[PDB]
């Protein structure tokens, strides 16, 4: 009876592991004698735990190693594991202890380098600059990191290493594909969460005896699952990089299966509706994009709201959103030789979001071309002037608080921006869908084998709250006719 969680991440196409990958586990002790991980696991000779049995200490870590690589109930059956002990027998560690841990992994790699590394951090503390920093340096070293979202029924951005954008952050869903509710508490959520995975009622190795098993739940277990999927993917394609892998996870997850009613109203659009899965069979080039949301700006006269991509990604377009709709729009601006998406707030506005479309386009140099506010009869226009450049998005911001084909068309009083990228082998098309006045949502989707790179409402609008991509669907929220405009591209 294959466990639900294993059924769930498996896609309908299978054949009835993670051999050449190493997965480091920063948690409790583990019982390496257990028949589930017997042969898989190597205890590293590292400890850093705070002051406070044989079974209970091993309890947590043993179960998680099982999920990752366990013979009967694990994801990456051929994975090789290594446990660093940074939590004590009550599950409690220190930030310094984790830092020394992470540093021990990097020195280990430097001394005996092996193949691709996966580091699993099934712990959370409060937001920590230093812990997020250390993670960021380790990711730039080339090590893939997976962390638990946290079990506090709260915004993941308030927790570390969850809040660290480099780390892959994983929330927990149950067998109903719903967010886990451990008592009053439960899975964390929000924009710092990358995807969700099985994390309720997960059968796994128990420390009580060498052939014992037990159900545990948490965002730890969810994390463990994706660590296993990472290992699988990385074994199959060892030349993959962190950015590549994060995009593939997102691409191959189940979409729109989480009932988002369980999240707080403010956090729904922010929380990605994705549940982890292994890729299907044959994969071999493809254009991958994801939506990066900013934090809510703050209610003041001028919006400090920024969305950033990762170093290796290109910002292909930029939109914005507000619950009220009071907003001055968005612009893309260069920052440290890399484009960022910035949204502005209106006088009445309670605050805005900046939404960024980040894509893996190994080609390069995505520039911004802006035209200033022009005139009535004209409107406002920008096109890509660069050699062999394609238009991938159209932003538009304006100064006046009071509202009133190869190029971007904008309002007479609006300042319009065009994102252009050097992608001579990428063709792009526009697609749109217009609906009469009193509707509140309007969507358009790119067809099979195309990627959505820009999403916007038709410039001659009426009452629009904002626009944003959700996977490959462009969504325009509203309160003549309102019309969604999507720019789709492929190789």
């Amino acid at each position: 009876s294959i466990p639900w969680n294993l059924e769930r991440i498996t896609p309908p196409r299978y054949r009835a592991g993670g051999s050449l990958v190493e997965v480091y586990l920063l948690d409790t002790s583990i019982q390496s004698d257990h028949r589930e991980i017997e042969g898989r696991v190597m205890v590293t000779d590292f400890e850093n735990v705070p002051e406070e049995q044989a079974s209970k200490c091993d309890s947590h870590g043993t179960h998680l190693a099982g999920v990752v690589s366990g013979r009967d109930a694990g994801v990456a059956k051929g994975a090789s594991m290594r446990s660093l002990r940074v939590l004590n027998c009550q599950g409690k560690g220190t930030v310094s202890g984790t830092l020394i841990g992470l540093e021990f992994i990097r020195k280990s790699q430097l001394v005996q380098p092996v193949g691709p590394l996966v580091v699993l951090l099934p712990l959370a503390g409060g937001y920590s600059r230093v812990l997020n920093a250390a993670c960021q340096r380790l990711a730039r070293a080339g090590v893939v990191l997976v962390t638990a979202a946290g079990n506090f029924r709260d915004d993941a951005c308030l927790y570390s290493p969850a809040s660290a954008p480099e780390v892959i952050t994983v929330g927990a869903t149950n067998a109903q594909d719903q967010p886990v509710t451990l008592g009053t508490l439960g899975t964390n959520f929000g924009r710092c969460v990358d995807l969700f995975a099985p994390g309720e009622d997960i059968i796994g190795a128990s420390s009580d005896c060498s052939t014992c098993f037990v159900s545990q739940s948490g965002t730890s277990q969810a994390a463990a699952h994706v660590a296993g999927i990472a290992a699988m993917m990385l074994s199959a394609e060892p030349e993959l990089t962190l950015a590549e892998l994060r995009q593939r996870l997102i691409h191959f997850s189940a979409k729109d299966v989480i009932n988002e009613a369980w999240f707080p109203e403010d956090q729904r659009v922010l929380t990605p509706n994705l549940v982890a899965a292994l890729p299907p069979s044959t994969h071999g080039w493809q254009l991958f994009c994801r939506t990066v949301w900013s934090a809510h700006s703050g209610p003041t006269r001028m919006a400090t709201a920024i969305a950033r991509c990762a170093p290796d990604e290109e910002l292909l377009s930029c939109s914005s959103f507000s619950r009220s709709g009071k907003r001055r729009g968005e612009r893309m601006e260069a920052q440290g030789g890399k484009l960022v998406c910035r949204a502005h707030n209106a006088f009445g506005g309670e605050g805005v979001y900046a939404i960024a479309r980040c894509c893996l386009l190994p080609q390069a140099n995505c520039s911004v071309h802006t035209a200033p506010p022009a005139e009535a009869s004209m409107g406002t226009r920008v096109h890509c002037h660069q050699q062999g450049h394609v238009l991938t998005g159209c932003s538009s911001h304006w100064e006046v608080e009071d509202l009133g084909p190869n190029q971007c068309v904008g309002h007479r009083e609006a300042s319009i921006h065009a994102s252009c990228c050097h992608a001579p082998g990428l063709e792009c098309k526009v697609k749109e869908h217009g609906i009469p006045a009193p509707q509140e949502q309007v969507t358009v989707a790119c067809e099979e084998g195309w990627t959505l790179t820009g999403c916007s409402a038709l410039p001659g609008t009426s009452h629009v709250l904002g626009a944003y991509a959700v996977d490959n669907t462009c969504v325009v929220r509203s309160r003549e006719a309102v019309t969604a405009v999507a720019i789709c591209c492929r190789s």
Partner: antibody
Amino acid sequence: QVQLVQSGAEVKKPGASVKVSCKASGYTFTSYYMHWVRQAPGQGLEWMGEISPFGGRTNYNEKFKSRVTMTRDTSTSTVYMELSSLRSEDTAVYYCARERPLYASDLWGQGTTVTVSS
Amino acid sequence: IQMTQSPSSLSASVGDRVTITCRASQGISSALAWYQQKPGKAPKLLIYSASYRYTGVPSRFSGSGSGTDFTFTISSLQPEDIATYYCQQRYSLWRTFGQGTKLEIKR
């Protein structure tokens, strides 16, 4: 397709020995432990011992430790079991079964009937 | 470890609930499996880890328990269930079966 097939029935004289074969098919033979349990006509199931996949290390029940000997064969994916100093009480059906960590030995052999008689 | 299984035999009529207990000499967490033996055939694994039913095993069958105190149950008895049922303990080095419970369909 997945199956354990074991050797046919045999007679042996009191004192003699017998090697019962048991061959794995369909699955990775090297992934699990292999158990032997027997059943006398009037008794019920009695556990003999087990042999691990890695290193062919073994562990036997204390009732048989002096007599029983188990051994695997990597190439042909088959596990053997030899019992010596055969007495009347050894007349039984002998089963091999793969045991996995979670799914406590889900796949069994057909049984091999052994008869100790003159 | 010592596995005391009871009753040694049980005659029940079709549609009846049937309970078999199984008591270890010491606490074995949940390292317990139940098997069914049809006469002539080898034992078939029914329940593993004390609670979980194996694939292609009717959902009439179920198990529960932890530590020293386990039970196996047929929710509704059927003719196909004529067999001898054994609990196996797998907590220690050596494996131990219970004595066995023989089912008879009362008719």
